[PDB]
Design a protein around this ligand. Structure first.
Ligand code: NI
Ligand code: NI
Ligand code: NI
Ligand code: NI
Ligand code: NI
Ligand code: NI
Lengths: 100, 553, 101, 553, 553, 100
């Protein structure tokens, strides 16, 4: 695979999202790190699919709602940023106020 | 020109009269003072203030600070004030107004070409924590503690060995030497404790001369009156501190017998509540004495629903005589009253190394909720309670171990060990940890990203934790004897060296905001704690702040 | 499209051009297989190989560099040799030369 | 004896006339020359050539190389040739024919008992990359860059501090000293840049004397004509380079005013296109001047569908004046024409540290696709375009910063910083990264496996990155003044030291294969870029090579 | 007072007559002797024996040990006995009865204030393993080996280079010097091997003078009679060992010709069975000679169902002449008989670095199952077989390479490299690995936990593996010549140095419990191995102990 | 668990395979690292099941077809190798031309 440091680092984010994904499935209100991990992983997969940065900046705001997270969590996450390899190389996706 | 207070707060951080909630607790601090001159605040960035001829002057390196933390909200034992912090030569240069004297008024912290900037507007800055009950079971504890905001670790051990598993002791010259050498690799200031359990003074003098800054008396090695007396005699001679974990079994005598052996000499009682060790069930009465500097370990802070249950097995007939709901509940209140002066971990030996700061604030939160405002409190804020509690893991531990001349608080001349916090994560996850003027660790996003913020963001060691830079930014504390004998040169220690002093003259009255000596009693049968006949107790929390909202596991 | 693919131009490469060569019939009289590499001094190969050692003096196998010829027990075959170049100083092998020639 | 060309290629790698596709791009290189003697190629292994008395001689260590890279396909600014590479004493000894003179003809690289072998047949070997726009935001950037094939990093910073987040500046003697000490721990060659924004020359001389090899003028610290002039005056005096990030706000003047301040003195303009900073919207016109060495940062390379969208937020009224589709499209073409001479990252400050090499090749690919063959191109191959582009991150950055006497290309006498690539992964994931003659990092499989190839295979540090071995295989660049004042001995730097020289005499005409000075203009309203009245533009890519086929995320 | 033997075993570990199963194998050891005085055993803990005035005396540091391993069950080549182990100054001080002479009888290991304690009751303690066939392909191999219980690694290499991939050779003075410097960073004792393939003695003397403790003759560099003779001549001169990987191709001659070249001089034959390299198909006959010290690499240990299948590709006409079911089956038996004296890995070059100990025990298990008790065995236990096998990776490798004066067994005066095992995980996953008196690595649970045992528990480096502490607890072996020339001071090596001696005088008769010289023959056509005309063979295992019950993958 | 370095290293491979497994499920054509990770993990589980080296060397060639991976990927993977603990200890499994 010849995994570079950044590829291995992203594996950490992916695994953190798996934790969050299973807890959301149980019907738990997600906390701060779980929310950040879940939305971030969603975006990385979107980039793998070939979605545009513009499309993901919007879609990323509809992953979790205020009723699915603990109190105060939406305010602790003014935005989420993550980079992934799009068909046209690495791009930064910034999702503002992802949780409403 | 005018600006609304809300817009101002968003731009430069809060000012006089503004209040800030500490993380998700019910504790609120109010800015007591602001050392700025409205309109002359320094801000860094494109088109901002800190630029050549403007907020940045023409002075040479010698005439300006190396680092300035702009618009910081300082929370320390002496006050909660808004100001710029200047750092020079790895030490706190001044707390005041930064800028360029050529065009700005009231400048006390000169910014020049040689000045680096850390934007602290909207952030809370505190001194680095000091944990004095470390079991050196593994080197990984250092990074864990640093990440939590603890910059100085005092303790003993040689690794995952039976002796260290149970006691904070680095036995003998050989191990002391090896551990001092190993210390150069850790990004925190370190001081070691030797084994104080022996009735031959020379066996103790040897250890102090080798490098330890204190001696630990632990019952596992025999906390007998003879051993206690011997350790204190050498301590008075060599100006080092003694830490005590008394005879829980009451084998050699009761608490009064131990107190008698101590004979009014200065001593630091570890986990004074008792669960972590000590005369069953009244070791807690020690906090009434003037020569005792009492501390608590953190698993009992604060009293919660699961506390008792988990403690039985972490322990495992004298189990139910050591684990007592009565003394555990009283301990929280005694902290709130200032009867207990320090908080510590007791790392991997009935204590959590990364939860010293976190648990101290949870106790303050629970006490405010249960007891309301403190008698010393003024205004509609919790400023005094905050000053009383922050002192428990900063200045008080430093005073107790004779290192307050180097660290322990944000005061001029002290080593620049500072922790920057975002209010929403105060006491839980710091934004930046500075060791001796250099950032040692901080949360960092994708290394290959276009900016440092993209995920995943996790704590990674910075330049202040690397090789020689680390050596220059950390301190290894030695006893006066070791320093004199040239131990540093002999072992070829590469880090900066500091010497401990003033361990024998410190007393309860010197503990900042925590000098109470209560008329405390413990019922031998019921274990009920009473101060002046009044029952001291509290209720166990079912849910606590600084918990599930911040941690992934 | 194949990442890092080659576009080798057709043809052949002539090896060791302009060097003296000679063919010798070799027979493996041993009971175990013997394999000889391209640059080994042929005159000093395993004694079980029967051939005119005198003719192979200063020679090696005229085969692609890095390749080898195998001789199973009792196997007889003719090989082409090419003369050593450079200083033509032979050192090592079975220690029979240890000097020029 | 004869052998087919295909079998030959499979055995020793391609030869004269053969073509190789670079990774999954449309770029094809053709072997221009082969320094071997057919039939005398050296191959290592059981029963192969490199053995006692055969391909390996009887010479003593002094008379043979320490390392030989066999059958390598060299791609450098001077040529694309097949040859053996000899390394001795950490430096490039010779490029020629390896072997034993006792029995082989034309041997120029003697192999002896003291010679280690790296089989390079079928591999492409290039010099290590040189990134001159590094923000030292975190130490982890070094490993990321090394893994990508970058062996020298020039920049400034003190860690994740506001000043460093925005600028490549290591402010003052104290921080400069600390960072030089920290550099000994990193596996890449390092040179530091100080803060050049000041109108007092002595404040600059102090920094140069402390160790920096250059000064960065950044608008965040005030890119005023007075500061620019002052920095250049000191640069001419001390033979150090100046890097510039101009006044985007046009506060002190327009681009012509800045150019006027520079006064024809040598200067390196960072991200000359403008998006990363500079006079809005015509900083790009700087590439027309003889004294300007222009470079690009990598987020704009190449122009793609998502480029503009991502740039707004990575930035965030002057946003739409800084981010311009017009100048971003023209930049790619200007690189293809040789008007822009270097590529860099701008690590974690609008740039990706591990994508300098990768993005340079993506631009070359896109330009071939859109513009076809270059006017200088001969034969049905892209050899010249490849030489023009590889020079952008190897020799040109070295010349610009006065370190070309040590690194920058595969030439005799230079430090042996080499990168071995498999054609299928060229520019993306290297097979081996050599620092000063020792392998510093390489992909490595299961440690407990019977061979080094089983999964998982990922980059892990090797012996060249360990302690003292690392110190011997890396270089810390110092200014002539610092070297003279004995800074290395004072700070007790353990790595090899090199001094920069020739920074003031280098000009656009010296940039290898990239010396074009076009008559370029920018329309103030439309932002259209024109060279000799002709419009310069290109189309955004929807998909790029060296992307999704190689990365897990 | 009396106590049942079961309660006693649970409290202090087994005693004389008690048997213990080694992991999940069918091997059982029986305690042969116990050096304690029933009732006077030392136990550490609250209210236990090791306390001031009780089990701990009043002696000064010089008069007591630094570390004591209490109630250990020692398994070594000389015996399987229960005793306390004393360590002083990083070396084994004594094996006997620990305590305080003031109140206890028969004390030979004095415990004082300077004594650290490691509770070994219920644990098995062995010397650290010694692997003499290491390919330094990557530095990560050191931690892998250390975790498995190997504390000394002898081999050669420069990293992931072709030469090292195939041979255990560190070519020439430059690479030898660089690797010696890199060795200071690894937590294991290290000795290097140079390239012995050359017919010019001076080219060899240079390497020995540079630091190598041996020379490796590998067919890849030409294992010709001339090279072999030359290497042995220099070896006899400089007192260093020669390791051999013979001519598999039979190019320069057959096995008898190689044996003739050796001329009765001392030599260590690597992977004597043949699969890993050597004269096809009879290199195995070498174990009949008095001057040959034969070892096996581990992929062929033991013979199992998948052995042959995996070996073809790990190898890939001479494949089926090298991989032989006949010789592979016989090898196991030859080990059981003591004809083969050592086991090694052949790390990442047809060998698993973390499976040397594990595989040695699997062979012993399979041999007991197939052959029953050994002729030397007494009692209903496998004590002798255990002594014979443990010697293969401890004392015998040390003797073979002239380092037995420093390491190799638990004997007074030797470096304190010890491995503590829980019986259930013996040979698989150790509880503690001690390097020179300090714990270097051990399994460690949650760092932030209240105790060191909570999950996840995985191996993490301890204080003995950190910086200067590591340097003091490890040894770099040098040749007598290198030591004399002052190589350590020149390269500025920081670790403790040891010199090899006695390499030329060791012979087969000196191999502890493995001195058999069988009249062994190999059929040229069938490859059948026969000792005295009897066929030597064994059956392939379908399932083995120390496998799937312990590993996650 | 007392996880050794090699056990922890294999956890990295397992996690990389999880990434690939989910993308294949979405109907994406796998890239180079995803393919290597997926086939490798398959083999490790086969060893855990107790399958022979010979059986896995063949089965490993039927995990992914040329139509399930990106262009050029089959040619970038001439073979895949991985070791795992079989009932009879650690063994190396080499799958030649795994993607056809
Ligand atoms: Ni205690
Ligand atoms: Ni404790
Ligand atoms: Ni810039
Ligand atoms: Ni920049
Ligand atoms: Ni071998
Ligand atoms: Ni080997």
């Amino acid at each position: 695979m010849e995994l570079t440091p950044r590829e291995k680092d992203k594996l950490l984010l992916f695994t953190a999202a798996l934790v969050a994904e299973r807890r959301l499935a149980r019907g738990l209100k997600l906390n701060y790190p779980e929310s950040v991990a879940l939305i971030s992983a969603f975006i990385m997969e979107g980039a793998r699919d070939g979605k545009s940065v513009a499309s993901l900046m919007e879609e990323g705001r509809h992953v979790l709602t205020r009723e699915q997270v603990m109190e105060g969590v939406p305010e602790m996450i003014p935005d989420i940023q993550v980079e992934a390899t799009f068909p046209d190389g690495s791009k930064l996706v910034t999702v503002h106020n992802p949780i409403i | 020109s005018n600006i609304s207070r809300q817009a101002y707060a968003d731009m430069f951080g809060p000012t006089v009269g503004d209040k800030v909630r500490l993380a998700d607790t019910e504790l609120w601090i109010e800015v007591e003072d602001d050392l700025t001159t409205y309109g002359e605040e320094v801000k860094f960035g494109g088109g901002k203030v800190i630029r050549d001829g403007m907020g940045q002057g023409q002075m040479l390196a010698a005439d300006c600070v190396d680092l300035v933390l702009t618009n910081a909200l300082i929370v320390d034992h002496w006050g909660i004030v808004k100001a710029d912090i200047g750092v020079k030569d790895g030490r706190i240069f001044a707390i005041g107004k930064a800028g360029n004297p050529d065009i700005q008024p009231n400048v006390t912290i000169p910014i020049g070409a040689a000045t680096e900037v850390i934007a602290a507007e909207g952030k809370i800055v505190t001194a680095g924590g000091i944990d004095t009950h470390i079991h050196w079971i593994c080197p990984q504890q250092a990074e864990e503690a640093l990440v939590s905001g603890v910059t100085t670790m005092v303790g003993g051990g040689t690794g995952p060995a039976a002796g260290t598993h149970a006691t904070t002791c680095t036995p003998g010259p050989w191990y002391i030497s090896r551990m001092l050498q190993a210390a150069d690799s850790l990004p925190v200031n370190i001081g070691l404790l030797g084994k104080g359990n022996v009735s031959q003074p020379d066996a103790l003098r040897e250890q102090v001369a080798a490098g330890v800054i204190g001696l630990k008396i632990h019952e596992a090695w025999g906390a007998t009156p003879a051993a206690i007396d011997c350790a204190l005699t050498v301590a008075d001679e060599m100006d080092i501190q003694v830490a005590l974990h008394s005879d829980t079994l009451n084998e050699s005598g009761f608490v009064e017998d131990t107190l008698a052996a101590i004979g009014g000499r200065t001593i630091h009682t570890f986990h004074t509540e008792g669960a972590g060790g000590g005369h069953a069930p009244d070791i807690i009465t020690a906090c009434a004495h003037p020569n005792i500097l009492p501390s608590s370990t953190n698993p009992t802070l604060p009293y919660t629903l699961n506390t008792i249950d988990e403690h039985l097995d972490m322990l495992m007939a004298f189990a139910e005589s050591r684990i007592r709901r009565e003394t555990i509940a009283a301990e929280d209140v005694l902290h709130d009253l200032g009867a207990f002066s320090l908080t510590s971990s007791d790392s991997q030996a009935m204590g959590r190394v990364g939860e010293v700061i976190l648990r101290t604030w949870q106790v303050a939160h629970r006490m405010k909720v249960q007891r309301g405002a403190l008698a010393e409190e003024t205004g509609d804020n919790d400023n005094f309670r905050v000053k009383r509690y922050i002192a428990k893991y900063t200045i008080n531990p430093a005073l107790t171990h004779g290192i307050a001349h180097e660290v322990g608080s944000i005061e001029v001349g002290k080593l620049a060990d500072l922790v920057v916090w975002s209010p929403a994560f105060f006491g839980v996850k710091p934004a930046t940890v500075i060791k001796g003027g250099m950032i040692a660790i901080a949360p960092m996003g994708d290394i290959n990203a276009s900016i440092p913020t993209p995920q995943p963001v996790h704590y990674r060691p910075m330049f202040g934790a690397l090789g020689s830079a680390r050596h220059h930014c950390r301190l290894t504390f030695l006893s006066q004897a070791a320093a004199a004998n040239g131990v540093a040169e002999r072992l070829n220690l590469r880090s900066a060296i500091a010497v401990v002093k003033g361990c024998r003259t410190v007393q309860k009255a010197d503990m900042v905001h925590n000098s109470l000596q209560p008329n405390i009693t413990v019922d031998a049968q019921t274990y009920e704690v009473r101060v002046d006949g009044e029952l001291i107790t509290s209720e166990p929390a079912d849910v606590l702040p600084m918990a599930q909202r911040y941690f992934l596991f | 499209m194949i990442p890092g693919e080659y576009h080798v131009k057709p043809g052949q490469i002539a090896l060791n051009t302009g060097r003296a060569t000679c063919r010798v019939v070799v027979e493996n009289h041993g009971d175990r297989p013997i394999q000889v590499g391209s640059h080994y001094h042929f005159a000093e190969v395993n004694p079980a190989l029967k051939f005119d050692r005198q003719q192979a003096a200063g020679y090696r196998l005229n085969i692609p560099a890095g390749t080898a010829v195998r001789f199973e027990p009792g196997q007889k075959r003719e090989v082409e040799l090419v003369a050593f170049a450079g200083h033509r100083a032979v050192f090592g092998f079975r220690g029979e030369v240890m000097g020029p020639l």
